[PDB]
């Protein structure tokens, strides 16, 4: 059963509607951040099932994992291939560098909303999906083009191996 392939524009705008609704429902940026994360988590727990049926993985080590997330999973679900950089010497941390993040196409952050992590849904997705492969991880944004950085950066930290 082949998956349907689409341009990112409707997705981007729909995600935009979700963030707007949440900002109306909460009025507090930190809370929006948290709800985006929780939703992302519930999404990742289901998404990993789809991924493992379209990819031959299952697993290895934290490095192999980084490679599969950037080169296969992001490409498949977002049409982009983030770069992997800045590995910690222990190999328990790495960064995903997103030069182009579809979620923020057509988006510009209003002032004083500096606490808002617009694409925070992605941290929840990552954490949730990885948990289903018996990997506890922490995902967090440390660079965001919406705040003026040259790139968007998601820092990934391996906490433990669920068993």
């Amino acid at each position: 059963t082949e998956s349907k392939k689409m341009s990112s524009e409707l997705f981007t705008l729909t995600y935009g509607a979700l963030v707007t609704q949440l900002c109306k429902d909460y009025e507090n940026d930190e809370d929006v951040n948290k709800q985006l994360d929780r939703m992302g988590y519930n999404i990742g727990v289901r998404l990993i099932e789809d991924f493992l049926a379209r990819s031959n993985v299952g697993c290895h080590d934290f490095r192999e994992t980084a490679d599969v997330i950037a080169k296969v999973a992001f490409k498949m679900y977002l049409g982009i291939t983030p770069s992997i950089t800045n590995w910690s010497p222990a190999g328990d941390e790495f960064s995903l560098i997103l030069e182009n993040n579809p979620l923020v196409d057509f988006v510009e952050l209003p002032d004083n909303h500096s606490a808002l992590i617009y694409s925070n849904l992605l941290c929840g997705v990552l954490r949730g999906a990885l948990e289903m492969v018996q990997m506890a991880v922490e995902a967090k944004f440390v660079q965001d083009t919406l705040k003026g950085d040259g790139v968007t950066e998601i820092r990934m930290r391996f906490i433990r191996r669920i068993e």
Copy 2:
């Protein structure tokens, strides 16, 4: 500037999160229907700009319009090509037949939520985008696989030509 191409799964689940949030925020199916429509409208008004920069159209008649929506716009933004059927003799009505609607992948409607038009965002998108091409239209779901039909059907009615 080429658009990024992605699988529909993350989009489907994200739209699912939006519907869930709205159902929590409203508790009333009719209202969810209306908000999905309004959001869809705001999305379509912007989306049409992207479309006209990726498509050579601008316009003709209601029939040509049907053809561009099903064969070019749906394919581009949702990865599917709906069929056009049941033209009214006056040529002011037609139906879009969606055998597969990405928005409802992995979705099953709970009971008593018969009034909910799960993918109603699409009616708003259509109405809004068409309005920007000086066409007033009405879009409405008359068949929905989520309610047991063999296909999903969106009935399109041309109201007037904005000028």
